[PDB]
Amino acid sequence: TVTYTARVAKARFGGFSKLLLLWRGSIYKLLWRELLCFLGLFMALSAAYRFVLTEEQKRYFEKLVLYCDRYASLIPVSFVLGFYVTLVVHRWWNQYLSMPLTDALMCVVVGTVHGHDERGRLYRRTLMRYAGLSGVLILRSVSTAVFKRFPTIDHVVEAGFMTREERKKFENLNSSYNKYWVPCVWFCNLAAQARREGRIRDNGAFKLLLEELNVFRSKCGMLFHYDWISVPLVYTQVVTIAVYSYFLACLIGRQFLDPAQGYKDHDLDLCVPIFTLLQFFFYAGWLKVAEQLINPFGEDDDDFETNFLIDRCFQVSMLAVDEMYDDLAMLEKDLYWDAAEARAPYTAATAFLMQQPSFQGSTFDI
Amino acid sequence: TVTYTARVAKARFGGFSKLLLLWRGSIYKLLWRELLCFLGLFMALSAAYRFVLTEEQKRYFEKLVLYCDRYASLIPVSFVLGFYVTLVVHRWWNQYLSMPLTDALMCVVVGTVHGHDERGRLYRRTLMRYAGLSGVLILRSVSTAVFKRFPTIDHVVEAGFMTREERKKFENLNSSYNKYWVPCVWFCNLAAQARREGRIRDNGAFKLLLEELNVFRSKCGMLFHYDWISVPLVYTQVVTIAVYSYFLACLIGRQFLDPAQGYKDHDLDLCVPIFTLLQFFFYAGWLKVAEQLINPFGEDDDDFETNFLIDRCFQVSMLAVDEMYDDLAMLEKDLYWDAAEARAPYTAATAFLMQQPSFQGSTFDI
Amino acid sequence: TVTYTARVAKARFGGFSKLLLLWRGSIYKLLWRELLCFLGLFMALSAAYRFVLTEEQKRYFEKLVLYCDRYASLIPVSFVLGFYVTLVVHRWWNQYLSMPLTDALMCVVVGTVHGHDERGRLYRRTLMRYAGLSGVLILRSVSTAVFKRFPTIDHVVEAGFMTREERKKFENLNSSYNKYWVPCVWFCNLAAQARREGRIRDNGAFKLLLEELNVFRSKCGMLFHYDWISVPLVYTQVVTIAVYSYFLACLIGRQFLDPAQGYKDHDLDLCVPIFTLLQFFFYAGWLKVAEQLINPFGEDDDDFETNFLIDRCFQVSMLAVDEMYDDLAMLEKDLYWDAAEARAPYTAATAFLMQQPSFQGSTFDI
Amino acid sequence: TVTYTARVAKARFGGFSKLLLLWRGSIYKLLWRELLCFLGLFMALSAAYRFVLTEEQKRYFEKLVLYCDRYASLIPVSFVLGFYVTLVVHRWWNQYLSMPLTDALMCVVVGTVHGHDERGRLYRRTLMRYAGLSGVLILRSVSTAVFKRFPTIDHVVEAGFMTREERKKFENLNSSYNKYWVPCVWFCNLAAQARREGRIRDNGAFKLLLEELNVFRSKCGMLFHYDWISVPLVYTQVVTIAVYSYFLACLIGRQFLDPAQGYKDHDLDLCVPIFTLLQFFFYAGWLKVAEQLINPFGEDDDDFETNFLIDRCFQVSMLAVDEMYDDLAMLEKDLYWDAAEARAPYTAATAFLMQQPSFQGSTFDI
Amino acid sequence: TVTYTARVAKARFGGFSKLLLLWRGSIYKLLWRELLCFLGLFMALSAAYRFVLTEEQKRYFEKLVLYCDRYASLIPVSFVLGFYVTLVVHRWWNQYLSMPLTDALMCVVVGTVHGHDERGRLYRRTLMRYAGLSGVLILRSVSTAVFKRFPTIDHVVEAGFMTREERKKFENLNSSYNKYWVPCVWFCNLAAQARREGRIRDNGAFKLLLEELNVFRSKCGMLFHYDWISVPLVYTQVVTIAVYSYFLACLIGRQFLDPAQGYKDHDLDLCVPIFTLLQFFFYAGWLKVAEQLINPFGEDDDDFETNFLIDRCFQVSMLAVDEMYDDLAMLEKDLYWDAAEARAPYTAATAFLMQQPSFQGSTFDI
Ligand SMILES: [Ca+2]
Ligand SMILES: [Ca+2]
Ligand SMILES: [Ca+2]
Ligand SMILES: [Ca+2]
Ligand SMILES: [Ca+2]
Ligand SMILES: [Cl-]
């Protein structure tokens, strides 16, 4: 993804206009091939009108220009763009929320699966490795960047997400369907094994572990659903036809006609259709928002950094359940033990502008 | 469903335009009968204007063409299309989310219902068979493809979802209503039987099983609600009248009049209303998005593959609770036991483009 | 409700157009009185223009027709129709989801409240009768069809939802507010009584029963909220004024003026304003979608069948907790015990069109 | 709130038009001062054009009228009205859902906090009084009607929501922030005290009590968030400027010019701009929907009856946990004990129109 | 944030118009630099048309003015403004809901972590300090105001959110990623330590503590997701190009041409484009709603007061778990113990307007 959150923290004078100078993840990277072929096909029709066509063929083409400018209905293209892109954006955000993230599991695992010995250490890592394995298996199914990192299951074994013994049981499962849910079943068998030996101390801890896994597994199942159940193809084709019919109407209907015939609204030569160019940046760019986000798991610049989230979850969950298992600093009194209230100090860059009346409710200054 | 997720992974130059060459689940499969009758009725009026009508009947028809072009309000058809299709798409996605999927149940069942013996094996399979039975019974009520696969309850018995003894108790239940919830009540009786004999070891395991079933049963109840409570018929008829009134206005109001009378905006002969054809692809295709998705359980190409999801859930849940019950690979140290951190390697097709600064927050490059 | 889900299963050639032949729950049943008075008031103005008005009064009326056609802004009526009806449809669907349905309670009750004896049988039925009683009491408050079925509380006693002893405690509660929540408090007292005598065997079962009831009771409270907190009246009046101002503008502004004065866009006589009639079917029908759904608990054809849902829930929950309490078929091996995988067979009407490659992910055909 | 749910139960012929005769909570109560000043400023400009201006000053004003009618863009005002009011309506409904309602707490308290003695009675009432106290404290912060009922905390003590001993501990808490969450902390201390003495019998009961309180406390925190975090002021000002610029354009651009100069679309005298008046009812009334609902806790007619909900919750929860604690009618057989099925009878006003085939699914009439 | 909730409590006559006099968080503070450069560039073109250009260069510029007024399509800018700002507002509200608030944790901690001694006191404060520490660490990552208050981790140690011993374990964690989740792992280690020593008395209390923390930790993870995954940059650039192309079209297309050439719709001199100025307040202000809210964690006036919420949560949670741990007022009878019902009194400013029939349901006045 292209992150510009710091650029737009405060609404400044040229704020969104300086985002028109970015190139990575931009409209210009997405549209310049389409803009050059649209403008090239415009100049080719404009040059045929000037130097190629005979005088009676120019009059017929002039009647064709006035015809197509009637059908350039720029207003209804916006609704099928507005409703469709909002659908794609809604799917795009829920696909990010369905990312297999092991943070909720790693807090349950470090709190409930016990033992400083090598066995309890191996219980905690294998539970997190199985959650990470289900993450890798569903992301190499839906994300082309994860798939180029893990083209085979042997790549998942040499990366350490799966072992060779787990590889044998994975491949010997007779199922024609995608086996991303298999380490989630291994998680339940491992947690039930840990409950039997008392490494999970109580049944509410074991229940919390299985509630947390089902939340994780249903997120993996949701990424498979979004990958399988596309935005409906008829709806993608309707918005594509509506945008391209508008631009077919524009490269004839916005041609600069010869002013000597006195056609109204056609008394000018610019030899570049600059406001049709800006309409192309608007409407074809609005469609490119959907074209970038309809599969947010490819290698667009604004697509999800799924290999980063795999490396983050695997490193952090192994960090949380192995090194950080039961090493607190000793319980020690804070700065505000002798203090009835508790307020942290401000720097000089925040003390001066803040420190203003605390909001108590709207009805109190009555 | 028609899945084109891999085609649109990266936003390419001709990306959405190559989806206009697909036929399965396309606008062209949905609209070509309507387009040929619209264009045929257009050419029939155009031929009556040329060769049939007398010269004074042509002038009256010419006044009728100018009348109907005033009422071709292409803008308000788009709002009742945009708001209605978004409602249908919202129902269509929530109907997919309400699909009876046994994955969350199969992780609880393999983790909580215990025993390698034939009895505990039979407990785990019957719990999954009862969840799958409620899935088949609600899907043959709402999906025509499941219903043609299971036309009678005897078809459900010969498919193995129900047994002959379960068939007797199913048919002897005196209820006039659909009995899809009956195996969910059998699930609760079976899980309570398994808790009594200690195959479910603790009450939090038994509670998790019943929470998971109620989530499954309410998904089955939601598919019945969507099947029963349609999109409101008055709202379907308003969008149908609005689209067809627009196209009734178009096959008169876009007729190519004789240029010798000098009617403005009517100085051309194309003998094919090509931009009215593209408007028909836009508006009637936009309605066809709703017509395909209003019942997503029929045999449209873009309808849900409900027999596939039945075969997947039954095969996977039987695979998860029978063969995969308590056969882990032995707890064995990963690649990153001697390693404080944990990073999986990259292939050459992903190492070169990735490996870029880790995002820590927007405020840190301040 | 009017259910047409089977009619629109597959998108057919005349699919939504055959729904324009339905009468029950249709636009024509909702609009024909309004259409006849609109067309009657149109013909009355058209007849006054032809035979009543003098020649100088016709010119003033002709200036009035050209005035009102300027203000027929058909575009902004659509936004206040599109945004308002979507609000009403959103409330209409959430009101259906808030229906008091006892299925989630009946699965907990049959799984947790125990005993084949007459006492445990009476515990299970009274818990379901109290849930059904809260359903009847909130639905006779919000639904006119339930209220005509239960006009008094004595009707609820003779229907068997309440007993005479429960009637005394119901009427002796000193509260000015609606007492639909009273059997939900009786449910909690009954479940706590059953936990004390061990008919509820464990505390997690008793907790699940009370979580399930609070979900049921908050659904009853939500139906009271929707009944009390209407769509805001100012917003209902704004959309009513916007639609009727448009149609006031239309029955003057679309009058067929005398062509001898040569008023432009007014050179025709149809003596029926057929495209204004179709605009009336569009806009007034779009408002009628809201008028039918703003209270979905009346006796519109497309209103909820609330007496059916009362009869279904009472019959099914009594069927689930009394006859179906702990009578499973004996645990018996399925068709797929000797089979490593598990696939159900297809009929000849589904084997031929299906059996096509299983989707594994989008990235795998790379 | 103004409740008209019974008026719109069945979609009738003059149904929404009879809601234009209501005055309480109406557009006319909200708009008549604005309509009289708009029409008064219109007539003042119209009278200056007739009797005050000289003949050359009338021509300049006539050029000003034709200028401002070009900028009366009634279409884009509707989008910033449609999107903004939908945001306000969404906040308005979620603010009603965040109302502190003690029904879910009172069902847990009567089911889990035990004892017929005066101590257990005092435990149940104090738990409900503390929930009601947090309700009063957050509603007097956000609702002007609750604040005029409880202007001081001493008013809350004389109303009985707080005691004098609780008043001392409330005032001696050193916190500059609003202390609405303080009785929720007292609830947790009281429930933990009741668990220690076994008035709460099991830990799952005590956990359910604390889950239920956190749902209640987060609803109180949500009302504080909505009160603090307004609809953004820039967005309120944009919709206010857009509506008033349109109406500034209208009281010049819709002036009836002198027909003797022959200005087109200006050949009439009405001396009342009746369709501009109806546009004012549309657009300024649409803004008044937002102006009424942006703070739904004031004393608008359509604002929430927050003092009613305080009196309802306090009376009902004291009724539920004190008098209704453990007085069931004795477990007694229903009307349908000797009956395998269970159907309640119909009155003559509902038997005749109902009793129609039970819906089983869409696929069954195949 | 700029809070005006009390100003708009009752819909008054000049209600939203008096919000056009506010300056803090206003359109005028956001737009005046853009308005002065737009009007300055307008007057510069207007002065070049009057005094600089020759008479034949004025005619070419006049043809350019009529060209650009054709492309000022004010209608489609509104849809890409309406759909985009609604997306930004939806993200802005969910970012406020994802704020790390310790109220739900502090009610569990004071109810479940026990002991009046210094050890149990230190357990309760350290659990709340660790929740507050994760709040500070994620807010200094996403909020520039928190970051200027805590520029280093040493600032977090001198503020008392972290200790020096906790600082050593924080810095010695080998992770390249943001370590905001580290005190949430410390929370789980501390709660598991407290359960082992019986300061947490039961396993359901310990489970509730870990469910509550995972809700808190996922809110911290959600703020990181929103900070990382921006509104997509192509969509921000499309709405920026659409607004600025419209205003590029306006500062030529709305130029006041010389009336002596008799250009239609151009017969006036105002020498200030006042309705183009109001359109600039509309459209550029509508974009400024998004520009203020796209990062709601900066130092805009309408941005979130994140340092206030840090100081509130830290002061209140230390107040709730230390001083308010197990000091109830003694269980004492309320005002309504001898009263069967329970109604609080009204002041004279609320008794007179209220006391009106209690709503029982819509169907009861039948
Ligand atoms: Ca992409
Ligand atoms: Ca279909
Ligand atoms: Ca109705
Ligand atoms: Ca208000
Ligand atoms: Ca900001
Ligand atoms: Cl639980």
Side-chain angles (χ1 to χ4, degrees), chain E residues 188-205:
Chain E
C188 297
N189 283 323
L190 194 60
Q193 186 189 112
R195 184 61 193 96
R196 279 197 305 278
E197 309 148 9
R199 299 225 169 249
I200 300 171
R201 297 204 227 269
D202 61 78
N203 308 316

Side-chain angles (χ1 to χ4, degrees), chain D residues 34 83 125 148-149 159 163 169 174-175 181 189 214 225 227-228 230-231 236-237 288 295 300 311, chain E residues 3-5 11-13 19 27 86 96 212 312 315 324 326 328 332 334 336 343-344 346-347 356:
Chain D
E34 295 85 353
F83 280 106
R125 289 179 71 87
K148 294 171 191 44
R149 188 190 181 176
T163 81
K169 286 191 175 180
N174 315 296
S175 169
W181 52 272
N189 283 323
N214 265 319
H225 294 332
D227 197 65
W228 191 32
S230 299
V231 191
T236 302
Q237 282 163 324
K288 282 290 170 169
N295 187 352
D300 284 327
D311 278 276
Chain E
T3 277
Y4 60 97
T5 303
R12 287 176 173 89
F13 164 57
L19 309 170
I27 170 149
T86 299
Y96 188 75
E212 216 55 277
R312 189 255 172 217
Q315 198 270 330
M324 307 187 56
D326 188 74
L328 302 151
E332 102 273 42
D334 51 336
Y336 312 101
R343 185 176 179 83
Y346 281 79
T347 52
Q356 63 284 74

Side-chain angles (χ1 to χ4, degrees), chain B residues 291-300 303, chain C residues 8-11:
Chain B
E291 296 175 48
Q292 194 158 67
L293 299 198
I294 183 169
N295 187 352
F297 293 111
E299 290 93 6
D300 284 327
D303 276 351
Chain C
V8 291
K10 192 166 176 314

Side-chain angles (χ1 to χ4, degrees), chain D residues 23-57:
Chain D
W23 170 256
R24 199 193 180 253
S26 80
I27 170 149
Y28 318 113
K29 177 184 284 190
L30 288 179
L31 268 193
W32 73 261
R33 286 168 178 86
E34 295 85 353
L35 188 97
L36 261 294
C37 78
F38 178 65
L39 175 68
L41 266 51
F42 199 96
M43 296 296 108
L45 283 181
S46 186
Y49 177 57
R50 289 156 197 258
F51 318 103
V52 182
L53 290 168
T54 181
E55 206 56 21
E56 202 51 50
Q57 266 180 318

Side-chain angles (χ1 to χ4, degrees), chain B residues 3 5-6 30 33-34 37 60 63-64 67-68 70-71 73 75-76 79-80 83-84 87 91 118-119 121-123 125-126 129 145 148-149 155 158-161 163 165-166 169 173-175 177 181-182 184-186 188-190 192-193 196 203 206-207 210-211 214 217 222 225-238 240-242 244-245 248-249 288 291-292 294-295 298-300 303 305 307-308 311 314-315 319, chain C residues 1-5 8-13 16-17 19-20 22 24-28 30 74-75 78-79 82-83 86 89 92-93 96-97 101 103-104 106-108 110-111 114 201-202 204 208 211-212 254 256 265 267-268 270 275 278-279 281-283 285-286 289 292-293 302 305 308-309 311-312 315-316 319-320 324-329 331-337 340-347 350 354 356 358-359 362:
Chain B
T3 277
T5 303
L30 288 179
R33 286 168 178 86
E34 295 85 353
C37 78
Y60 167 69
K63 300 190 295 227
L64 190 82
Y67 174 84
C68 305
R70 300 189 259 278
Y71 291 86
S73 295
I75 300 175
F79 314 129
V80 83
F83 280 106
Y84 177 86
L87 161 68
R91 288 178 47 108
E118 56 90 22
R119 173 146 207 89
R121 184 170 164 211
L122 186 49
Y123 265 110
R125 289 179 71 87
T126 318
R129 198 171 45 79
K148 294 171 191 44
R149 188 190 181 176
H155 280 94
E158 66 91 25
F161 286 105
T163 81
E165 293 299 312
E166 286 151 18
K169 286 191 175 180
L173 283 171
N174 315 296
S175 169
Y177 316 97
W181 52 272
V182 162
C184 291
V185 178
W186 287 346
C188 297
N189 283 323
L190 194 60
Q193 186 189 112
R196 279 197 305 278
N203 308 316
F206 172 70
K207 185 190 191 288
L210 284 194
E211 293 177 350
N214 265 319
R217 185 224 31 87
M222 194 60 54
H225 294 332
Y226 273 110
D227 197 65
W228 191 32
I229 314 299
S230 299
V231 191
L233 170 72
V234 54
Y235 197 22
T236 302
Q237 282 163 324
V238 166
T240 308
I241 280 154
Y244 289 169
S245 314
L248 172 66
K288 282 290 170 169
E291 296 175 48
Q292 194 158 67
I294 183 169
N295 187 352
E299 290 93 6
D300 284 327
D303 276 351
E305 278 301 281
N307 275 337
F308 176 79
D311 278 276
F314 194 58
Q315 198 270 330
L319 205 78
Chain C
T1 56
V2 180
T3 277
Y4 60 97
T5 303
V8 291
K10 192 166 176 314
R12 287 176 173 89
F13 164 57
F16 275 16
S17 67
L19 309 170
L20 309 171
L22 304 172
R24 199 193 180 253
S26 80
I27 170 149
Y28 318 113
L30 288 179
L74 39 81
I75 300 175
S78 287
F79 314 129
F83 280 106
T86 299
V89 162
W92 163 86
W93 183 247
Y96 188 75
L97 299 173
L101 298 189
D103 290 330
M106 88 194 179
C107 277
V108 184
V110 80
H114 290 299
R201 297 204 227 269
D202 61 78
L208 182 68
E211 294 177 350
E212 216 55 277
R254 311 274 167 83
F256 300 124
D265 307 90
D267 204 0
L268 262 188
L270 293 178
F275 276 109
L278 293 173
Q279 274 179 8
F281 275 106
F282 179 29
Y283 289 123
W286 203 352
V289 177
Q292 194 158 67
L293 298 198
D302 222 356
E305 278 301 281
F308 176 79
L309 285 188
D311 278 276
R312 189 255 172 217
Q315 198 270 330
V316 158
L319 205 78
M324 307 187 56
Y325 171 73
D326 188 74
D327 52 324
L328 302 151
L331 278 185
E332 102 272 42
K333 299 179 186 180
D334 51 336
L335 257 181
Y336 312 101
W337 187 274
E341 40 27 76
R343 185 176 179 83
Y346 281 79
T347 52
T350 52
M354 255 126 193
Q356 63 284 74
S358 167
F359 181 78
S362 60

